[PDB]
Amino acid sequence: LKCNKLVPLFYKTCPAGKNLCYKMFMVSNLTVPVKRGCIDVCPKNSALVKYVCCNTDRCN
């Protein structure tokens, strides 16, 4: 359950309250991640700002 906040900040372990990791960003240069965080709802996406949900180490 060790995730990171943003990119230039990273985070650590956010156990309790949350349960999975979640990244949110959009197209810019080569499919690059801009937002992350540990939460419990990462459903739906879009075409400009897509949200992904991780749940295994390197991401939560």
Side-chain angles (χ1 to χ4, degrees):
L1 336 144
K2 281 166 4 143
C3 279
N4 24 351
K5 214 210 223 211
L6 278 136
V7 262
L9 209 84
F10 295 8
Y11 218 59
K12 249 180 171 175
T13 320
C14 33
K18 281 107 228 222
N19 211 35
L20 300 112
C21 217
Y22 149 67
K23 306 202 229 53
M24 161 228 247
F25 32 97
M26 54 173 178
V27 287
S28 181
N29 293 116
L30 244 114
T31 328
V32 173
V34 225
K35 203 175 295 245
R36 339 168 138 267
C38 357
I39 177 158
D40 235 3
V41 160
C42 340
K44 248 89 273 234
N45 53 9
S46 202
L48 314 162
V49 305
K50 66 228 282 168
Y51 327 178
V52 186
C53 205
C54 203
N55 160 301
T56 345
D57 254 316
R58 239 162 302 146
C59 30
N60 168 318

